[PDB]
C-alpha cells in the first residue's frame, strides 16, 4: 500500500495531515502546505480540486520543500491515491482526436517521441491499464499529464489544450 502526510511547516512541522485515500478537496483540510511526505507507494496531487490544475506525481520519498522547487503559488487543492492496481501496461496512440490519424503502440518509456514516430502532436490516446505519465517536452520534462486507463480523444481528455508531447514515462517502479 502507500501513505502520504502533508505538513504546513517546512521542517515537517506546523499543522500536519495524514492522507491515504483520494480527496477532491484538500483546502477543507489545509489552505497551504510547504512540506509533503510519502512513506510508500505513489501519490498524485493536483493544484485544483477534483483532480485538476497543475498535476504533480510524487513517489515514495520525503519532500522537504515543493513551492519554489515545483514553481507554484500555494498548496494542492486535490489528490488521488495510486494503489497496486496494474493489470497490463500499453498506451494506444492515435494522431487524430477520437482514434483517427495514425495508431502507434507504446508499451515502454518514450524519452524522445520525435525520433520514435517522427511526430510530437497526437490528438488521441488510450491506456489499456496501469498508469502513464506524459511530458509536453522530451527527457521527461514540460507540463506533465497523468493518463490513466480509459480512452482519450482530444486535448480536453488529458486536460490539455495543445498536443506537443515529446516524452512519456511508464510508471513501473515502486
TrEMBL record:
Record-annotated Beta/gamma crystallin 'Greek key' domain positions: 2-40, 41-83, 130-172
Q: Which UniProt keywords apply?
A: Eye lens protein, Repeat
Keyword Ubl conjugation recorded: no
Q: Which domain of life is it from?
A: Eukaryota
A biological-process GO annotation: visual perception
Any one Pfam family here would be Crystall
Q: Does the keyword Chloroplast apply?
A: no
GO MF annotation: an example: structural constituent of eye lens
PANTHER family the record matches: BETA/GAMMA CRYSTALLIN (PTHR11818), CRYSTALLIN, GAMMA M6-RELATED (PTHR11818:SF129)
Query: What is stated as this protein's family in its record?
Result: Belongs to the beta/gamma-crystallin family.
Q: What does this protein do?
A: Crystallins are the dominant structural components of the vertebrate eye lens.
UniProt-recorded name of the protein: Crystallin, gamma M7
Species source reads: Danio rerio (Zebrafish)
Amino acid at each position: 500500500m502507500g501513505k502520504i502526510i502533508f505538513y504546513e511547516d517546512r521542517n515537517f512541522g506546523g499543522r500536519y495531515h495524514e492522507c491515504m485515500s483520494d480527496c477532491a478537496d484538500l483546502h477543507s483540510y489545509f489552505n497551504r502546505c510547504h512540506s509533503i511526505r510519502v512513506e510508500s507507494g505513489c501519490f498524485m496531487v493536483y493544484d485544483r480540486t477534483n483532480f485538476m490544475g497543475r498535476q504533480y506525481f510524487l513517489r515514495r520519498g520525503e519532500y522537504p520543500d515543493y513551492m519554489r522547487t515545483m514553481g507554484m503559488n500555494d498548496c494542492v487543492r486535490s489528490c488521488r491515491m495510486i494503489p497496486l492496481h496494474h493489470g497490463s501496461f500499453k498506451m494506444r496512440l492515435y494522431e487524430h482526436s477520437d482514434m483517427g490519424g495514425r495508431m502507434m503502440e507504446l508499451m515502454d518509456d518514450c524519452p524522445n517521441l520525435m525520433d520514435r514516430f517522427n511526430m510530437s502532436d497526437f490528438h488521441s490516446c488510450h491506456v489499456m491499464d496501469g498508469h502513464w505519465l506524459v511530458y509536453e517536452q522530451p527527457n521527461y520534462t514540460g507540463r506533465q499529464f497523468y493518463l490513466r486507463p480509459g480512452e482519450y480523444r482530444s486535448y480536453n481528455d488529458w486536460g490539455g489544450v495543445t498536443s506537443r508531447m515529446g516524452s512519456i514515462r511508464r510508471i513501473t517502479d515502486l
